[PDB]
């Protein structure tokens, strides 16, 4: 399996597993899962009440020092009752490492804003408000950042359609750009691409 296969890094896998045990036993009040992927990335899945205590730990603990917030992300998974998966990607420059902190919310439960931990979060979770509708409590200036000013809905929700509900054009009667319900001259052609044969037996879910 030498030339075409990505080489496995067992040293980083063992180190990130040990540090995941470390984080899980220092913070058992909030840590729900700890997992390390086969390409050696550490995920700490936490309860949403521990957004501030976990991230302040990883920012300030001498064996963590995750000083950089690389990215803050939501993922919409509509089959979960807490459909939004809030993803923090952190960089420790001291230990040359990355960690992922994952939590969850639904449409109505606010997540505590992490601007007091990372000021980098200020726009990112603001984007999570604009794209997903996740409210962040105690945010300094929480408002839309990417959509148009009167935009209804949250576009990166998976029940939000690809083309929206409205489209703009210039109307010369009112001398103004106007919003109308969207009509496409060509509908987006939905492709059903999935093969009906199983691709990866290692990821097979157990049946009913």
């Amino acid at each position: 399996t030498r030339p075409t296969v990505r080489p496995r890094n067992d040293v980083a896998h063992k180190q990130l597993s040990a540090f995941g045990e470390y984080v899980a036993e220092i913070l058992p009040k909030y840590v729900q899962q700890v997992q390390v992927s086969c390409f050696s990335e550490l995920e700490i899945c936490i309860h949403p009440d521990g957004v501030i205590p976990v991230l302040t730990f990883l920012r300030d603990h001498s064996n963590a020092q995750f000083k950089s917030l690389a990215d803050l992300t939501a993922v919409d998974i509509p089959t979960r009752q807490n459909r939004f998966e809030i993803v923090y990607n952190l960089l420790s420059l001291r230990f040359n490492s990355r960690i992922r902190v994952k939590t969850y919310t639904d449409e109505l439960t606010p997540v505590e804003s992490s601007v007091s931990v990372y000021k980098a979060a200020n726009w990112y979770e603001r984007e999570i408000w604009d794209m997903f509708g996740v409210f962040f409590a105690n945010h300094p200036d929480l408002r839309r950042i990417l959509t148009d000013y009167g935009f209804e809905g949250h576009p990166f929700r998976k029940d939000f359609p690809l083309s929206g509900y409205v489209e703009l054009r210039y109307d010369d009667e009112v001398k103004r750009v106007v919003a109308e319900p969207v009509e496409l001259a060509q509908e987006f052609r939905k492709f059903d691409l999935n093969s009906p044969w199983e691709a990866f037996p290692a990821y097979r879910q157990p049946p009913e």
Partner: protein, 126 residues
Amino acid sequence: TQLITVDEKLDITTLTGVPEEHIKTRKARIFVPARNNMQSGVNNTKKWKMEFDTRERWENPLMGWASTADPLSNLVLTFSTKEDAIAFAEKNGWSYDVEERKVPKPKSKSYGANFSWNKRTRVSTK
């Protein structure tokens, strides 16, 4: 206390920004998709799907393309169970109809039955 008790039904229709015509006139269909009978593979029959009723597609006068005015015409949602799909449809105010999962019933297969002594299940060729 730091937790409140809301006994009301979960309804987020005023927050999703969806116009009212595409809430109360749409029929969501919750279903496990049927197997393509062109193929024997069954991996596309594992999850529940939510689609909507197909609206009008008409001919573009310039090019002959399929024009639509339905924003939900390509919206297909994936769910692990039937109850997750029902909860998501009720949460969004969508009137839905649910088809039950159709599993193939277990077949009694015997290769020796191809060569029976006295039954009609003998194959005339092989």
